[PDB]
Design an enzyme around this catalytic site. Structure first.
Site, PDB file in Angstrom:
ATOM      1  N   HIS A   1      39.979  39.020  25.915  1.00 45.64           N
ATOM      2  CA  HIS A   1      38.650  38.906  26.463  1.00 45.64           C
ATOM      3  C   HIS A   1      37.931  37.625  26.019  1.00 45.64           C
ATOM      4  O   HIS A   1      37.539  36.833  26.853  1.00 45.64           O
ATOM      5  CB  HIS A   1      37.703  40.043  26.200  1.00 45.64           C
ATOM      6  CG  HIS A   1      36.372  39.735  26.770  1.00 45.64           C
ATOM      7  ND1 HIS A   1      36.117  39.850  28.120  1.00 45.64           N
ATOM      8  CD2 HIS A   1      35.298  39.109  26.244  1.00 45.64           C
ATOM      9  CE1 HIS A   1      34.893  39.427  28.379  1.00 45.64           C
ATOM     10  NE2 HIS A   1      34.379  38.958  27.259  1.00 45.64           N
TER      11      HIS A   1
ATOM     12  N   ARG B   1      47.707  44.437  42.222  1.00 47.17           N
ATOM     13  CA  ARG B   1      47.805  43.061  41.880  1.00 47.17           C
ATOM     14  C   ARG B   1      49.268  42.722  41.467  1.00 47.17           C
ATOM     15  O   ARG B   1      50.166  43.603  41.394  1.00 47.17           O
ATOM     16  CB  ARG B   1      46.756  42.723  40.821  1.00 47.17           C
ATOM     17  CG  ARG B   1      47.044  43.061  39.332  1.00 47.17           C
ATOM     18  CD  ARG B   1      46.720  41.801  38.553  1.00 47.17           C
ATOM     19  NE  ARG B   1      45.897  42.040  37.410  1.00 47.17           N
ATOM     20  CZ  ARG B   1      45.620  41.175  36.448  1.00 47.17           C
ATOM     21  NH1 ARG B   1      46.095  39.927  36.458  1.00 47.17           N
ATOM     22  NH2 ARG B   1      44.845  41.619  35.447  1.00 47.17           N
ATOM     23  N   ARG B   2      49.515  41.444  41.233  1.00 52.92           N
ATOM     24  CA  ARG B   2      50.782  41.020  40.665  1.00 52.92           C
ATOM     25  C   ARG B   2      52.009  41.442  41.467  1.00 52.92           C
ATOM     26  O   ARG B   2      53.078  41.694  40.890  1.00 52.92           O
ATOM     27  CB  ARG B   2      50.859  41.488  39.225  1.00 52.92           C
ATOM     28  CG  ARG B   2      49.949  40.714  38.389  1.00 52.92           C
ATOM     29  CD  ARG B   2      49.667  41.312  37.064  1.00 52.92           C
ATOM     30  NE  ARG B   2      49.314  40.214  36.195  1.00 52.92           N
ATOM     31  CZ  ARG B   2      49.517  40.159  34.879  1.00 52.92           C
ATOM     32  NH1 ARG B   2      50.065  41.179  34.215  1.00 52.92           N
ATOM     33  NH2 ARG B   2      49.181  39.042  34.220  1.00 52.92           N
TER      34      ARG B   2
ATOM     35  N   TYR C   1      35.537  33.719  27.784  1.00 40.09           N
ATOM     36  CA  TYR C   1      34.290  33.095  27.354  1.00 40.09           C
ATOM     37  C   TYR C   1      34.494  31.708  26.810  1.00 40.09           C
ATOM     38  O   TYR C   1      33.574  30.907  26.828  1.00 40.09           O
ATOM     39  CB  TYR C   1      33.484  33.992  26.427  1.00 40.09           C
ATOM     40  CG  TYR C   1      33.070  35.216  27.200  1.00 40.09           C
ATOM     41  CD1 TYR C   1      32.019  35.182  28.153  1.00 40.09           C
ATOM     42  CD2 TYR C   1      33.799  36.395  27.054  1.00 40.09           C
ATOM     43  CE1 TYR C   1      31.708  36.326  28.891  1.00 40.09           C
ATOM     44  CE2 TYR C   1      33.506  37.503  27.775  1.00 40.09           C
ATOM     45  CZ  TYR C   1      32.483  37.505  28.674  1.00 40.09           C
ATOM     46  OH  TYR C   1      32.327  38.733  29.315  1.00 40.09           O
TER      47      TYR C   1
ATOM     48  N   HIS D   1      37.691  39.542  41.390  1.00 45.53           N
ATOM     49  CA  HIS D   1      36.795  39.233  40.273  1.00 45.53           C
ATOM     50  C   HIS D   1      37.082  37.889  39.570  1.00 45.53           C
ATOM     51  O   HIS D   1      36.211  37.049  39.494  1.00 45.53           O
ATOM     52  CB  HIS D   1      36.763  40.427  39.306  1.00 45.53           C
ATOM     53  CG  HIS D   1      36.137  40.150  37.977  1.00 45.53           C
ATOM     54  ND1 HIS D   1      34.810  39.803  37.827  1.00 45.53           N
ATOM     55  CD2 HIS D   1      36.647  40.224  36.724  1.00 45.53           C
ATOM     56  CE1 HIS D   1      34.533  39.639  36.539  1.00 45.53           C
ATOM     57  NE2 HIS D   1      35.628  39.901  35.849  1.00 45.53           N
ATOM     58  N   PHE D   2      38.276  37.633  39.066  1.00 45.23           N
ATOM     59  CA  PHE D   2      38.386  36.444  38.242  1.00 45.23           C
ATOM     60  C   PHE D   2      38.482  35.104  38.950  1.00 45.23           C
ATOM     61  O   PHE D   2      38.138  34.101  38.368  1.00 45.23           O
ATOM     62  CB  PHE D   2      39.421  36.572  37.118  1.00 45.23           C
ATOM     63  CG  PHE D   2      40.819  36.839  37.536  1.00 45.23           C
ATOM     64  CD1 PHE D   2      41.659  35.824  38.032  1.00 45.23           C
ATOM     65  CD2 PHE D   2      41.355  38.078  37.299  1.00 45.23           C
ATOM     66  CE1 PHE D   2      43.038  36.117  38.373  1.00 45.23           C
ATOM     67  CE2 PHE D   2      42.702  38.378  37.579  1.00 45.23           C
ATOM     68  CZ  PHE D   2      43.537  37.409  38.148  1.00 45.23           C
ATOM     69  N   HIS D   3      38.965  35.084  40.188  1.00 43.62           N
ATOM     70  CA  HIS D   3      38.961  33.865  40.984  1.00 43.62           C
ATOM     71  C   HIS D   3      37.480  33.500  41.219  1.00 43.62           C
ATOM     72  O   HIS D   3      37.111  32.333  41.113  1.00 43.62           O
ATOM     73  CB  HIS D   3      39.878  33.985  42.238  1.00 43.62           C
ATOM     74  CG  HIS D   3      41.307  33.575  41.975  1.00 43.62           C
ATOM     75  ND1 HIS D   3      42.307  34.483  41.713  1.00 43.62           N
ATOM     76  CD2 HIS D   3      41.891  32.352  41.912  1.00 43.62           C
ATOM     77  CE1 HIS D   3      43.444  33.838  41.522  1.00 43.62           C
ATOM     78  NE2 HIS D   3      43.218  32.544  41.612  1.00 43.62           N
TER      79      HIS D   3
END
Ligand code: HAS
Ligand code: HEM
Ligand code: CUA
Ligand SMILES: [Cu+]
EC number: 7.1.1.9
Lengths: 166, 557, 33
Positions: free
Chosen positions: B228, B444-445, B232, B379-381
């Site tokens: 995680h 995913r994946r 950040y 979410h992460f893109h």
């Protein structure tokens, strides 16, 4: 404008922490609610239940897919599900409708996922550990099991079936 | 020796430039798989084509590894080493120790080189999370280790700059950019303990042949200890750029220095004790601990909700200053003709739904709906490939001139704006499809193009995915051309590079100095940060390290 | 000048996006529970 409006900004900032915090707490609350009801049985069991991956499909409760559903109360059944490089035993899992189903899932190889389409069942399966989740199916029919954790070249093809009897 | 005497008055430009170039080179290669993967989630198989351009590519999943390792780990780390060493160095007009800085760069190059070998040789097709008991070549773990470990040399470099500057200015408050850099490198030190312990104790001895296997539950818990906070570590460089540079390029000031400090202080505290939110679906990790890490996760979004208001109001202030008029006059007053500015502001827009998806993901039981579906890349893109990357792409406009000299021609500014809008637009379009395919339970994946009859409910957000594959293919190619063109076009020019970055003047008020004083007790807060980590991972790791269940390693590709 | 109206409208959009997303998935959760 500016410094006079600096007082306004550090004050509007205060309202926005105030508000952010209150909505984050209402979420914490509405999660709490899901934690106290039947829906919570999809959360994996806390306890460590260790097994041995290289033995698990020869000796023990996973070595016979015929003997995978055991009736474990008047309205409860336990299902020893093995997730393996590139399918699931038993296929299908055959469970009655309305019963608490207690899945005990393990792997003889690498990590797999066990995601039952149309349910909240969504657990990672770890070689050497036992994932225990509980669920009651309220609707008969077929439910595909997707493996949603990359495990090798056959990953996109790893599916299973739950048949929950009318 | 230099007729570009640059790299002997500010040679910290020389190093920084190597950090960025190598990082942007990683992005290009890593990203080349991107569109192929987007078309895969579009139910169009295009690897038969790719395999014939890049004959070394054995599979979709080798593609995804390279894509992941090269974009999310390597470009981002290198963008962080560049920015977070060079911005605090410039604010303070001190020189980073150069023997160490060249070392850090060398440790990162030797790393990428070493890790990349078995990845292109198809000997470590284990994804960028490399979950045991999938077993990679030993050179991939030793590569990732040395590559990661080059951030320790960077942590030293910045704390040294801070020590020396404090010595020269007793009783002066840490200037803003440096304060950011410092909490940031301290936060990464705590963060990296996890992945470092996973390598040194488990992964390295396993793959050299020194133990037969690894416990996957611990390997995955140490990983997410780092896993995680590492996002950040991707984000805060952009946030650094956004807080202290963007408002000036926008016409304005940062509306609050303590606000920005506060945000960063809060990432030091709460970025690390929260990784169980990646394990909502793991066995053998107490439900109660998951509830703690979940509440704590929702707290790590508070600093970000603050950034939203703080950035927003800064843009608004700039906009008004530039003649912006009504509820929404101020948006079109911003310098929309400057890619430096546009790229991170589009990033910020994408960030709105990206963050609302993280909040959903963080909510424990709600994570069963979406965990391991296409929704997560959705979410992460929005976070890293859009905001973090776009702040890096837009950087090129004000940072590269600053480092090199070579000024941006009008046709380079224009190509910039095409790229940045197409990148943005491809990401929004890809986000919908992936968010929507996710709620339809598409994993995913997965090479799902090989099972084209499998997800029929997903036909229509699958069109969205194709659409975007093609947009992002055009944009990536327009970028490669643009990036090579900003570097290659022969403008070996003097003045405009003798430059301190376009830092922002800041607004000051009476309620600054007491807050700013408190937040500057850095030793105090780092200790609180390290205590929160012990209190969050300690109970759970004691149990696990007492119950290690090593399992054989597998190769399944 | 006075009111940073713009910024508020931004955090308004933020909030709403957050709610639509969260309440949306909270219903999916129950409908699958
Ligand atoms: C760089 C990267 C990333 C950032 C930043 C990020 C932020 C969050 N994420 Fe995430 N994430 C999760 C929760 C969060 C939360 C709570 C936040 C928060 O930090 C986000 C807070 C953000 C906001 C509340 C948004 C604030 C909005 C702003 C600041 C915009 C202002 C706009 C302006 C000013 C524009 C206005 C201008 C105009 C002109 C109008 C969870 C759950 O707890 C999972 C696990 C899911 C699963 O099953 O695995 C997860 C999984 C990931 C994955 C998967 C890794 C893997 O391979 O499994 C990637 C790498 C990732 C990256 C990133 N993530 N995340
Ligand atoms: C260039 C345009 C891009 C396109 C079309 C694209 C497309 C995609 C798609 C569709 C996926 C999901 C594939 C899957 O989960 O099987 C994916 C995965 C991923 N992308 Fe990208 N992407 C792009 C750029 C980027 C960038 C710049 C980054 C990082 C800075 C990034 C980071 C990642 C990561 C970390 C994963 C997941 C790796 C894994 O699950 O093992 N992507 N990409
Ligand atoms: Cu089993 Cu993917
Ligand atoms: Cu996370």
């Amino acid at each position: 404008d500016q410094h006079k409006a600096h007082k306004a900004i550090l004050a509007y900032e205060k309202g926005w922490l105030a508000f952010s915090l209150a909505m984050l707490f209402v979420f914490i609350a509405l999660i709490a609610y899901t934690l106290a009801t039947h829906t919570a049985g999809v959360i994996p069991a806390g306890k460590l239940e260790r097994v041995d991956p290289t033995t698990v499909r020869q000796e023990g409760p996973w070595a016979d897919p015929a003997q995978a559903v055991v009736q474990t109360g008047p309205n409860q059944y336990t299902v020893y599900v093995l997730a393996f490089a590139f399918g699931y035993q038993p296929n299908p899992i055959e469970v009655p409708q309305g019963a608490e189903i207690v899945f005990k899932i393990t792997s003889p190889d690498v990590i797999h996922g066990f995601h039952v389409e149309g349910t909240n069942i969504n657990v990672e399966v770890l070689p050497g550990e036992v994932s225990t989740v509980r669920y009651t199916f309220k609707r008969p029919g077929e439910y595909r099991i997707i493996c949603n954790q990359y495990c090798g070249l056959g990953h996109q093809n790893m599916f299973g079936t739950i048949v929950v009897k009318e | 020796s230099e007729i570009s005497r640059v790299y002997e008055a500010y040679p910290e430009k020389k190093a920084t430039l190597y950090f960025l170039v190598l990082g942007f080179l990683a992005l290009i290669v890593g990203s080349l798989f991107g569109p192929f993967q987007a078309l895969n989630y579009g139910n169009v198989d295009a690897y038969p084509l790719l395999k014939r351009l890049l004959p070394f590519v054995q599979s979709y999943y080798q593609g995804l590894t390279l894509h992941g390792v090269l974009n999310a780990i390597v470009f981002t780390q290198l963008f962080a080493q560049a920015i977070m060493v060079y911005l605090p160095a410039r604010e303070l007009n001190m020189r980073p120790n150069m023997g160490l800085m060249w070392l850090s760069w060398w440790m990162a190059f030797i790393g990428l080189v070493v890790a990349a070998l078995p990845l292109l040789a198809n000997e470590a097709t284990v994804l960028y999370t490399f979950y045991p008991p999938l077993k990679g070549h030993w050179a991939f773990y030793l590569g990732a280790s040395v590559f990661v470990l080059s951030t320790w040399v960077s942590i030293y470099i910045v704390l040294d700059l801070w020590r020396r500057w404090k010595a020269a200015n007793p009783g002066k408050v840490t200037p803003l950019v440096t304060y950011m850099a410092v909490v940031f490198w301290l936060m990464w030190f705590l963060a990296s303990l996890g992945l470092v312990l996973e390598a040194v104790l488990f992964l390295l001895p396993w793959s050299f042949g020194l133990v037969e296997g690894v416990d996957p539950l611990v390997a995955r818990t140490l990983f997410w200890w780092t896993g995680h906070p590492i996002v950040y570590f991707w984000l805060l460089p952009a946030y650094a750029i956004i807080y202290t540079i963007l408002p000036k390029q926008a016409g304005g000031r940062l509306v609050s220095d303590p606000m920005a400090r506060l945000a960063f202080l809060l990432f030091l505290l709460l970025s690390t004790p929260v990784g169980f939110h990646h394990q909502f679906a793991d066995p053998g990790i107490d439900p109660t601990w998951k509830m703690i890490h979940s509440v704590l996760t929702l707290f790590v979004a508070v600093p970000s909700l603050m950034t939203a208001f703080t950035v927003a109001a800064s843009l608004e202030f700039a906009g008004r200053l530039r003649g912006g008029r009504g509820l929404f006059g101020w948006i079109r007053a911003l310098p929309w003709d400057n890619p430096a500015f546009v790229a991170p502001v589009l990033g910020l827009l994408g960030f709105i739904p990206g963050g609302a998806g993280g909040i959903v993901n963080a909510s424990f039981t709600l994570d069963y709906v979406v965990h391991n579906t296409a929704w997560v890349p959705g979410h992460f893109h929005l976070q890293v490939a859009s905001l973090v990357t776009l702040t890096a792409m837009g950087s090129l406009y004000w940072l590269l001139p600053n480092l090199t000299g070579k000024p941006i021609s009008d046709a380079q500014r224009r190509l910039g704006l095409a790229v940045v809008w197409l990148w943005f637009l491809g990401m929004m379009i890809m986000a919908v499809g992936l968010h929507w395919a996710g709620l339809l339970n598409v994993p995913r994946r997965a090479y799902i193009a090989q099972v084209p009859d499998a997800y029929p409910h997903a036909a229509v957000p699958m069109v969205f995915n194709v659409l975007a594959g093609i947009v992002l293919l055009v944009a990536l190619l327009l970028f490669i051309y643009g990036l090579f063109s900003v570097l290659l076009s022969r403008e070996r020019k003097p003045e405009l590079a003798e430059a301190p970055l376009p830092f922002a003047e800041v607004i000051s008020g009476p309620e600054d100095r007491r807050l700013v004083l408190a937040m500057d007790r850095i030793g105090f807060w780092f200790a609180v940060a390290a205590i929160l980590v012990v209190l969050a991972y300690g109970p759970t790791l004691v149990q696990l390290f007492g119950h290690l269940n090593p399992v054989p390693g597998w190769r399944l590709w | 000048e006075e009111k940073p109206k713009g910024a508020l409208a931004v955090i308004l959009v933020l909030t709403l996006t957050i709610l639509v997303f969260w309440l949306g998935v909270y219903a999916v959760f129950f409908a699958r529970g």
